Amino acid sequence: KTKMLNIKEYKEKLLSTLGEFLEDHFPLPDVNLITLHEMLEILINRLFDVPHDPYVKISDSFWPPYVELLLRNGIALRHPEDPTRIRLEAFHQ
């Protein structure tokens, strides 16, 4: 439990700081466009909920300059055959 307590405490601090960082440096952009922080949550969940098929289809909500930001730094990858679908990098493996 003590190992769990430290791990869970660490994750909450990490997640809380990440949310503050996005609000200060990437405000909501000026069909409705969702924010970058909302985009990240979609990709992360799909990676864990569906381990075998984590690909997500690009929609009009994702306005392209944000998509290039994730793709350039290595956080996201296009599907090798269909460039319409992107996934999240498997960091834990």
């Binding site: 730094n73 990098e89 498997a90 493996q93």
Partner: protein, 163 residues
Amino acid sequence: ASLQDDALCPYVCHLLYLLTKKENVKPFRVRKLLDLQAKMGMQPHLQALLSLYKFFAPALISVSLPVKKIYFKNSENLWKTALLAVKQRNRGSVIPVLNSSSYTKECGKKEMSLSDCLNRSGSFPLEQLQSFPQLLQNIHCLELPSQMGSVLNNSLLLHYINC
């Protein structure tokens, strides 16, 4: 991340050669290096870095390298003459080769051991053992070679097999 830019690639490879430890090698970083190799081909400074990655994680990469040429060019740096002043201030096979224990240890494992989960003790890696004071502390727990004939010309392992 600087490996992406072609201008700094040879120099970053030299820097990453020294800093690399076991914790740094991770599977996702292993895929990045292979991707860079497809785009640029057989770059000598990449071949050195890949070999260091194979040594730490042989279960991920397999490299056979031809034979030892100097991969990183030993060009005279701008501060080489000054280092001489700084150094003055500071001054003023029949037998098998040594290799870590065979990586079929663990191999297919359902889950980590309870002792490992609690971070209890462990073993001393063979590469770290290079001095007699280091042998004195860790005589009771050691990692044996893959092939036991390599102990023949290693003086520090003879002290272990003496008793």
